[PDB]
Nucleic acid binder design. Structure first.
Ligand SMILES: [Mg+2]
Ligand SMILES: [Mg+2]
Ligand SMILES: [Mg+2]
Ligand SMILES: [Mg+2]
Ligand SMILES: [Mg+2]
Ligand SMILES: [Mg+2]
Ligand SMILES: [Mg+2]
Ligand SMILES: [Mg+2]
Ligand SMILES: [Mg+2]
Ligand SMILES: [Mg+2]
Ligand SMILES: [Mg+2]
Lengths: 141, 185, 126, 57
RNA sequence: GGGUGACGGGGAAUCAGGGUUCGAUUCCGGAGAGGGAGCCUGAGAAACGGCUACCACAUCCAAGGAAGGCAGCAGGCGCGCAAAUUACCCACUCCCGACCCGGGGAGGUAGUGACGAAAAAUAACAAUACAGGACUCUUUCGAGGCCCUGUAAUUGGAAUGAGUCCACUUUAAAUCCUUUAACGAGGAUCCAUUGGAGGGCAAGUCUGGUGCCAGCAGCCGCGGUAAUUCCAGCUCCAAUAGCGU
């Protein structure tokens, strides 16, 4: 069983210490590893430039093309395959335009039917894509 | 380095299980019986009750004839009687924990308007209060949630400098007096 | 006629050469008396002119038939033009100030730092 | 494989409709009044196997 | 020995009891003035709104020479997901000086400000037409009304702040509130919003369109021509000056 006694503190606290690494969420957050693998260098969003509209194909039980945007991030030069959500919104996006890109809601782990798209587009040229979908603001010219 | 405070808190705590059904039912019923503008205004009362409940609990953990207990518990009971919630004779601390929401909502200017006749419905009462028509003691307590001290109950009435209280009439009747004078007459 | 007044927390500050107190002002249904009307009302009450009286800091209350502020009375003006803020005097025109505008004096003095001796140049400057 | 053509097919070809008009709706306390009134006094009827605040036969 | 998305602390967020995470950041202590080093004066510095070198940047030169350091306050550029006006004043709070008098971007005041926090409007009352149900009455139908609730007619005047605005107050000089006259409400107006409405999870097996498409969906899933899940319209649900990610 457990170490239990009274001048143990060290053994107790050190054993916990060694084990905490076997936790998955903790090793993520303490080995730098994942902050290195983050395109969003430990960031909530990332501005990046669009360099090709790429149709992603959904995972089997659903059949559908998912119309993503290949973004090169600005802070890195780390490329991305972000999602353009909502219907016909890919059309608002036109190549080389300065999207803001956020996470897809799972703080890593790709979501949905899509394979590997970790990110969604938020703002195309400083505008916000909700406003364009709704019809509120417009892409300038 | 400046003057300034930076000392502020929140006055309410949101519920965890956000769609419980039974909770939503009870809160809305509270809103109906006492014409509250918003769910959270209920949750502000609940929270001021809860603080009291924590404070009471904490005192019951102290051994009796522990100075800290005696003084602080008495002050809490004194504070609670002052507002019209506990009765003298009932003052001894265990009775705090058997004390509910409705007791604390019952002592608002909005109630103690509508309670003291004066209004004509609780929503009317709340409108009155806002519209500077009702004065506590000698000030025009604009604010509904003004907890009315038991001490300060019998000094609730209409505001002197107002249509209802016995002053200059409002701008609607002034207009309708001008219309009857110049236009019609 | 119908204002009223009271005199709270009265005190005889011998060694600032003054009486100083907290003015109370009841005045229901009128729009916070100007301080000139308080002075003349205090003058006839304390029987010692307006010219040595200085009053300020008047805050009305809610509802609006009670203001309250601070007032003091000097022995003579000769005393009041000595033991008083300069602003409070020219509040009723008796110790007015220059119109140099701070920024201009500092700019002027940063030139001058540039030059030695020459009283005429240091007089000129800007 | 698969194109990027159709994109806004359905957002495009829906039958367009007006957003109607009705009224200036009660907001704030008034709203809360209204809803408390229409669950706790007006109806309160004899039951017939449960209710439905947006039912439609 | 190595690392730190490490200045120490007071403290902050959660929290039953234990805990976990945070702490650049108004108090206290440290360290630094691009980088390193050396020093002069001085009670006190290894000073940077002091010098002397070097390195890195960079500015006039009549090309011999000469000058420079915002991690003060404003502001600019850049970086970036990420952050305010080259405003006014020494009146308060304190400091410095030979000084009761001078100086202080310390500090105070305004401006920007949905960082966040406290209060708190967007309607209230009446009779009507009615639409209902505890009472009294009536076999039921119907009626008497202390009780009442919905929808209308805005039917009815009464009440009011948003706002516009003389004036006072405020104040260093202003504003802002506060005080206050004069104007100021029929909603077609002074229009509430964000997100939902298969389950988890509060709320339509409604109508139209699309037909594994386009799209939704944190998860389970929905979509291949009666889609409760998509795009719409209706109604409804939640919170509400807030609510999404
Ligand atoms: Mg480091
Ligand atoms: Mg410090
Ligand atoms: Mg620098
Ligand atoms: Mg140093
Ligand atoms: Mg040095
Ligand atoms: Mg500097
Ligand atoms: Mg910001
Ligand atoms: Mg400063
Ligand atoms: Mg807030
Ligand atoms: Mg409005
Ligand atoms: Mg659900």
């Amino acid at each position: 069983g457990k170490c239990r006694g009274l001048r143990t503190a060290r053994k107790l606290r050190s054993h916990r210490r060694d084990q905490k690494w076997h936790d998955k969420q903790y090793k993520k957050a303490h080995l730098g590893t994942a902050l290195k693998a983050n395109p969003f260098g430990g960031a909530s969003h990332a501005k990046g430039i669009v360099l090709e509209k790429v149709g992603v194909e959904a995972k089997q039980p659903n059949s559908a093309i998912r119309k993503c945007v290949r973004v090169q991030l600005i802070k890195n030069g780390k490329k991305i395959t972000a999602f353009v959500p909502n219907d016909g919104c890919l059309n608002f996006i036109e190549e080389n335009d300065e999207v803001l890109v956020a996470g897809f809601g799972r703080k890593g782990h790709a979501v949905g039917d899509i394979p590997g798209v970790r990110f969604k587009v938020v703002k195309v040229a400083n505008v916000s894509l909700l406003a364009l979908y709704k019809g509120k603001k417009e892409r300038p010219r | 380095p400046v003057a300034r405070s930076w000392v502020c808190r929140k006055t309410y705590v949101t519920p965890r299980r956000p769609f419980e059904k039974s909770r939503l039912d009870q809160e809305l019923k509270l809103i109906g019986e006492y014409g509250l503008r918003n769910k959270r205004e209920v949750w502000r009362v609940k929270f001021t009750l809860a603080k009291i409940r924590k404070a009471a609990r904490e005192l019951l953990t102290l051994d009796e004839k522990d100075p800290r207990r005696l003084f602080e518990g008495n002050a809490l009971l004194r504070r609670l009687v002052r507002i019209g919630v506990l009765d003298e004779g009932k003052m001894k601390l265990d009775y705090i924990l058997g004390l509910k929401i409705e007791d604390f909502l019952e002592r608002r200017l909005q109630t103690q308007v509508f309670k003291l006749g004066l209004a004509k419905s609780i929503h009317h009462a709340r409108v009155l209060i806002r519209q500077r028509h009702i004065r506590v003691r000698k000030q025009v307590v604009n604010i509904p949630s003004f907890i009315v001290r038991l001490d300060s109950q019998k000094h609730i009435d209409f505001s002197l400098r107002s249509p209802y209280g016995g002053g200059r009439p409002g701008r609607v009747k002034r207009k309708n007096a001008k219309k009857g004078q110049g236009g019609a007459g | 006629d119908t204002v009223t007044i009271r005199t709270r927390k009265f005190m005889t500050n011998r060694l600032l050469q003054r009486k100083q107190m907290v003015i109370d002002v009841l005045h229901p249904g009128k729009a916070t008396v100007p301080k000139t009307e308080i002075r003349e009302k205090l003058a006839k009450m304390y029987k010692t002119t307006p010219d040595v009286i200085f009053v300020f800091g008047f805050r009305t209350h809610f509802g609006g038939g009670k203001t309250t502020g601070f007032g003091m009375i000097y022995d003579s003006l000769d005393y009041a033009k000595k033991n008083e803020p300069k602003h409070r005097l020219a509040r009723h025109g008796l110790y007015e100030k220059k119109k140099t505008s701070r920024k201009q004096r500092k700019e002027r003095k940063n030139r001058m730092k540039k030059v030695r001796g020459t009283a005429k140049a240091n007089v000129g400057a800007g | 494989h698969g194109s990027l053509a159709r994109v806004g097919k359905v957002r495009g070809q829906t039958l367009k409709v007006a957003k109607q008009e009705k009224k200036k709706k009660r907001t704030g306390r008034a709203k809360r009044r209204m809803q408390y009134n229409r669950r706790f006094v007006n109806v309160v009827p004899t039951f017939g196997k449960k209710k439905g605040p947006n039912a439609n036969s």
